[PDB]
Structures are given as structure tokens and as C-alpha cells.
Amino acid sequence: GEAPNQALLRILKETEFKKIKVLGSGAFGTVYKGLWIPEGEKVKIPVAIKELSPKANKEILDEAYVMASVDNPHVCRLLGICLTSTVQLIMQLMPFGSLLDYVREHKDNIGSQYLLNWCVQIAKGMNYLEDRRLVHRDLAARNVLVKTPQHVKITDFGLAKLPIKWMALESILHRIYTHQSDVWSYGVTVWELMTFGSKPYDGIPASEISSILEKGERLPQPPICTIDVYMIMVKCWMIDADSRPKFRELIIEFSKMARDPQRYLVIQGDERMHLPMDDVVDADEYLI
Numbered sequence: 001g002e003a004p005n006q007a008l009l010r011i012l013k014e015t016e017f018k019k020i021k022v023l024g025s026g027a028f029g030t031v032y033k034g035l036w037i038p039e040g041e042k043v044k045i046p047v048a049i050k051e052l053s054p055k056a057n058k059e060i061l062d063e064a065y066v067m068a069s070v071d072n073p074h075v076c077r078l079l080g081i082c083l084t085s086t087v088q089l090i091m092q093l094m095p096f097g098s099l100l101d102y103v104r105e106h107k108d109n110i111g112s113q114y115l116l117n118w119c120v121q122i123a124k125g126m127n128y129l130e131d132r133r134l135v136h137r138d139l140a141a142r143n144v145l146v147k148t149p150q151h152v153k154i155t156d157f158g159l160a161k162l163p164i165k166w167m168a169l170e171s172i173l174h175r176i177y178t179h180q181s182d183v184w185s186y187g188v189t190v191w192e193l194m195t196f197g198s199k200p201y202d203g204i205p206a207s208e209i210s211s212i213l214e215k216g217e218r219l220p221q222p223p224i225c226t227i228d229v230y231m232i233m234v235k236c237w238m239i240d241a242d243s244r245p246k247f248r249e250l251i252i253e254f255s256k257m258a259r260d261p262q263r264y265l266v267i268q269g270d271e272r273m274h275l276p277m278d279d280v281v282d283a284d285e286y287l288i
């Protein structure tokens, strides 16, 4: 069969971390901004802690199973798990929150250089998930988190294995999901970034959309987009998925553009923008 999955999963102590503040509250549970101090290691990792029945307990353990199996620069790191009355999941802290909210928050101060690098960074993240035989199944701007304005990570693949508007057509008709089903949602996620956070197909019922794509309609060319960038989103939205590009290729193309950013994204006032307890280390450095 496949190769053995020798991911190590780490059990952490409740005494070993302390929760500063609440990041969010939902039906899943509550997520805390926090710090994690391994016993006698002189390090303080900034973490996000998720805390929340029997079916639910299961859900979080399978999440953990997934996150432990993938560890990478470009996918959020899972530090570990804690076995408590309520099981707690300990992840790397992404200080600036979701790319979707960042991109709406600073639309006026985001240059073309930052955009194209995000497109590259995310493609690299999916190329890794491709290499790991992992189909994300829910790629979207809400599920990218910002470590620094210069570094973004894919996170929240609850649905990952091995949201109609982001889904590939085949996924809508047949509930089929492939890597090429993720390339499509990649295109939608880029379209999200280039329109600076716009809702795709806003004002449209979900039940029409399947027919829309069968007719041949797609999302429009965002203003700031050269036909070079846009031509690429459109290639992700082919009906035949063997004709959509490979994440490896999107890495190469977007990378090319990144070298001459203002040739591919025309943003008004582009070149005039910029973007923003001793023991603390980032989780990316802590692991090795």
C-alpha cells in the first residue's frame, strides 16, 4: 500500500501552556491566543489553543491526525495535543489572522509585490499537499492565515483527506475531489485576493452556479489584473481538469511575475506603500 506514516504526535501538559486571550468562539469550541513553555527548555512558543459530546471529540482527534501528518513551512504547524476533560489542540499562532480579513483591512496599503508572493507561497503550500497525497477540499482565502505580511500559511483543512462557490464543477455535480479540484479553488482564492476580498458571485443563489459554469460563465477579470494574471485564473477554471495547471506550474508562473510585480498588477499608487518576553521563539524554529 502507501508508505508508513511515521508522524510523531506530541502530548502536552496543561501546566505547560497558558491562555492569554480568546481568538474566537463558535460551535466547534473556543480558540485561545496563548503561550507554550516546554518544561525546562527556556523557550516560549506563541500558540493558538482550540478547546470545546463523543462525536465531537472524535472530530478533533481526526483533525489532529491530519495536522500531525503534514509538517511544513507553508502549512501551519501543529505543536501538539493535550488530553483533558475537554481535549485541546495546540497550533502555531498566526498573529495577523486570516488573509481574507487582512486583504479587506489593508486594501489601500497592499502592493502588487505582496499579492504575487502570496500567490506563490500558497501554490508552494499546495504543491506540498499534492506531494503528500493530501487533497485540501476547502481552499479559500478565509483558510489562509498570516504569520507576517510577508509569509502566509494554509490552515484549517478540517475537511482534508488521504462551500459551493469555490468548488470545481466536478466537485459540485459528483462530489469528486482531486488535486485538480484544488487548483480550481486556488484560482478562486487568487480572484479573492486580486479583488481585495470580494465575495465571489455575490447576490447569486448557490443552486444556479452549477448551471452557470456549464453555460461557460466564470468570475470576471479584476481591475488590477493584467490579462497575464487573469489568463491564469481562467486556466484553473477549465471544465476538463487535465487542462488546468499543476500547482508546480503556478509556482513557476507566479514566481516569474513576482520578479517584475508592477508589470502584472496595476495598483494605484503602488510603489508608495509599505506594510507592518525575551525567550519567545516561533514554532517553525522550535521543531528543527
Ligand SMILES: CCC(=O)N1CCC[C@H](n2c(=O)c(-c3cccc(F)c3Cl)c(C)c3cnc(Nc4ccc(N5CCN(C)CC5)c(C)c4)nc32)C1
Pocket: 023, 024, 025, 031, 048, 049, 050, 063, 076, 089, 090, 091, 092, 093, 094, 095, 096, 097, 098, 142, 143, 145, 155, 156, 157
Ligand atoms: C478565518 C480565520 C478565523 O477567523 N478564525 C477564528 C478565530 C481563530 C481561529 N484560528 C484557528 O482556528 C486555528 C486552527 C485551525 C485548525 C485547527 C486548529 F486546532 C486551530 Cl487552533 C489556528 C492555527 C489559528 C492561528 N492563529 C490565529 N490568529 C488570529 C485569529 C483571529 C484574529 N482576529 C479575530 C478577532 N480579533 C479580535 C481581531 C482579529 C487575530 C488577530 C489572530 N487564529 C487561528 C480561526
